[PDB]
Assembly symmetry: C2
Homo-oligomer: 99 residues x 2
């Protein structure tokens, strides 16, 4: 994974997406969508899907939300107030931390 | 001899000669003159489920 100040961004289009395999696997700690009902994601059709990936501390996951203030939101990653989509966060202590 | 198991975070202290607690005196007891070694490491990713 990339660092937060250089967060990785990918665009996906012309694809058949199975959102069940994301929802059923509950190992993700934070699974919060904003503009839509999370259970309804397998019923709507879109284009130009954006996925941004990075790694942050445990405390600052609460700063990834529209209309949020702090240190990382206003210096590293700012979300639009009218943002629509979903956010996924899960633990990575095993491999991303070293003794 | 090699013995293996899984315990909580705070309990690694109890695995030592001349220790008192709950696991030390009810599940696993170490002889006072024990010779050998003890190894412990975290497994939160693998042994824990949401």
């Amino acid at each position: 994974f990339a660092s937060v100040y250089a967060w990785n961004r990918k665009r996906i289009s012309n694809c058949v997406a199975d959102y069940s395999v994301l929802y059923n696997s509950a190992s993700f700690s934070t699974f919060k969508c904003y503009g839509v009902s999370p259970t309804k994601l397998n019923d709507l059709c879109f284009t130009n899907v954006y996925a941004d990936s990075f790694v942050i501390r445990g405390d600052e996951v609460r700063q990834i939300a529209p209309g949020q203030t702090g240190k990382i939101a206003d210096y590293n990653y700012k979300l639009p107030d009218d943002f629509t989509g979903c956010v996924i966060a899960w633990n990575s202590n095993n491999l991303d931390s070293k003794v």
